[PDB]
Subunit: 313 residues, 3 copies
Amino acid sequence: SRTIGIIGAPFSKGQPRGGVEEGPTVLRKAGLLEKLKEQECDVKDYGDLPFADIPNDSPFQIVKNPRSVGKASEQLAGKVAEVKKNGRISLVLGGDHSLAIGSISGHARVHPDLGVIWVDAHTDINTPLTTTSGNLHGQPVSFLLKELKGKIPDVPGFSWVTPCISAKDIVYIGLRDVDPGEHYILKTLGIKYFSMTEVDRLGIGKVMEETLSYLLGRKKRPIHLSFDVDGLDPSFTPATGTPVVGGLTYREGLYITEEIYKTGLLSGLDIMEVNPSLGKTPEEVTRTVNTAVAITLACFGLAREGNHKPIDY
Amino acid sequence: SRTIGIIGAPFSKGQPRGGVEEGPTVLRKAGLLEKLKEQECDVKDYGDLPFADIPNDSPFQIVKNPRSVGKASEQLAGKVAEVKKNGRISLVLGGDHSLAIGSISGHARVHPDLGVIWVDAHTDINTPLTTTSGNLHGQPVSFLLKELKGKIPDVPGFSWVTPCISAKDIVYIGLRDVDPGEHYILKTLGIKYFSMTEVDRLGIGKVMEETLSYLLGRKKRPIHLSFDVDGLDPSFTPATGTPVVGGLTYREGLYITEEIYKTGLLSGLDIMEVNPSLGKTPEEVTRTVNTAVAITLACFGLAREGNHKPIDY
Amino acid sequence: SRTIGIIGAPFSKGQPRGGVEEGPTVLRKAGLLEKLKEQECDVKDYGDLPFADIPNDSPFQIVKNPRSVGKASEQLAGKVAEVKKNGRISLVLGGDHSLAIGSISGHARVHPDLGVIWVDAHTDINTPLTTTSGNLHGQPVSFLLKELKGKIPDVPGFSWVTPCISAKDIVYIGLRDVDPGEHYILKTLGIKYFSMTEVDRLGIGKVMEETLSYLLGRKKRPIHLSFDVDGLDPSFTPATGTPVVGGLTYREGLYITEEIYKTGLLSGLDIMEVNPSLGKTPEEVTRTVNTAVAITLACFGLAREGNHKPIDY
Ligand code: NI
Ligand code: NI
Ligand code: NI
Ligand code: NI
Ligand code: NI
Ligand code: NI
């Protein structure tokens, strides 16, 4: 049985636009918990993490809200490690992607051998020294990679951090807006990725075949899927802060997750960057939330071909 | 030469929403006959079947309008068998999909060896005992399969029925909203299908290769294509009663049909579920009808690469 | 380094709808030059060609504006041949596609061995004798093919013309609206093409593999890409005179060009048929121009996976 641990993380200081901290809210009221139970899922809601208000959090060089970001992630890492010890797949309904730092960190504590699939239009691997915006939702990966420790300076709020994954344990899918420094890091550290160009070339089918074989070839190991809503095309998930045209299809989104589900190795899930305040219409918000909800259910079993219980219909 | 027999079937009691019985009307006024003739097609319009008004048709258990549905289908089966004996491909411009029962039945009478391709977002294989809605447009296949006779009760209006096809003579394409009982029947009877997951995985090209090889491997045999308009994505065919996101692409729709046409074995065609009254705008109606018209022309020869006569241009 | 030569060609008499002669304008103000320089490109703007006003230009049979069309193309051929001798890839920001005649002609002068990739929803290979509209933006290819000289009559304004490419040096991609005579010419001259049916069947990946292998198999040779904006789906490039549904995807558009760029053999580029006056909304115009701009940048290096300089980030 698929046992899940719901972690609400209403946080937004990893990026400038407010409203992403409403994510857990709109997703829950969308009926996410009820829908998960509607399936053969065991679900325990750990609630919305109450995030510390850090008033004195001036920039560190160019990095914005470092103490708020580092604290919220440190708080999440603890809860995630908690649900994992409870033998449940952690489902972090987030705000911005900077939370990936705490999410993946807490996961690795209980499962140091985890492999990561990062669905996103961006690589979010900028360092405090390479970021040009200073927004931490575009730097989470830089704090988690071991190869990169020595290049990430001491940023207030992240002293608790310890790179938990190496360049060979992560695969990107959906890339279409990568900075030059990020690209240099990709090729330099030899990180495996499938940008939109590879998806167009090979097909999402082969893309998934190759990604799983890549991460699970040597052996089976826990999988952490970090799903940034902007990885999908804006025609599907318009209410998000950093949209980029030419994204992953609604179908491709479901394919990716249906395939992950079928491995039986999913142990961590992040559904990030849904910002209801950024929809141009009420339907744009509804369209984003519904899509985010559908991708979530696919991670936990919902199959387009249908499902049925071990009973004689 | 492609000889066609147009059968207008303005029927809607297979489902709750009225307006689908206008289908033949909007399609004809869209210039369907003229366009078919514009090609190298021989076309005979058998007119719109005048459908009996059955006032006393109370539910059978949960099944709605059983006598109206069974009568309209029995009426269609007779006409279809008529055009087939006239050596013409039957083209049933319908209302709801429950008409598939009469359409496929009348077809098999003249060609008992027929194979069926069912393009739809749904499997429409619920039985009177498994249906939760009672709407017969989601049960046509259950009445036609031989393996299932023994599970389909005696429903008023369908005593004339006799399962004409077995589980190994039908292939589904486009599935994305299948009930648990329907899924159980799929896996239990070993029915061949390509849900959206398979289309995403293999590509519509391989999907078609496999479907035709599946049905025509052993030998060439007449093909009956039952095309439910909701099999295509709602961005293409929005004016339909049961839309489901993540559907077949406009291009994929044309690919499927262009491939069927090229076999030279098409003998029966159903273009169902177009409901002009369900469009949110006049353009949504026009968009649905135009797409339905385009898929029809592709079944009878229109090729995207172009066409030309056996003359020196 | 990718050295480019910008040629503005504000011309519209190859088709009935005015406004396409604004193309160079909207593209330049869209920041095209600046964006190209933003990359590792050397860019020289040869300006907007001042096109002769030919008042006395009555139809030739059915052919409209023959002297205006032939003159503007003759003028472009000279400039294109100029930038090519300057060792720069010619980038013709055009109006209508009839300019392809002058563009490809001037290119071949300096590089007679050139191969052509024609991205378009149409084959634009009608002859003055096969065209039913008389609009020259649908006849450019007929004037350029050697095999066809003997069938193209003496049309006022094109005496300067000399077919420069044979049927075996051109590949079409995106076809979905081809006339019967054009189709007859396709099959008769054995021209290589990938209509939307082939793109759906094989995938844009294989399509590109096959196209380049086809044209560059025997040997490496300069490539001329003639990109008609209507080759892409109208949901991407709506502001164009002859749109056709079921077109090339935004992603496929970028894939095609990213692949061409990677050959290192691009020498001529046409970005045609963008008509800002045909957008139903200001955003439809912006959407068309932005897409046309993105396809242009991809031809010159912009990669979705990212880019970086030969420096240590
Ligand atoms: Ni992103
Ligand atoms: Ni992200
Ligand atoms: Ni359906
Ligand atoms: Ni149906
Ligand atoms: Ni065109
Ligand atoms: Ni063209």
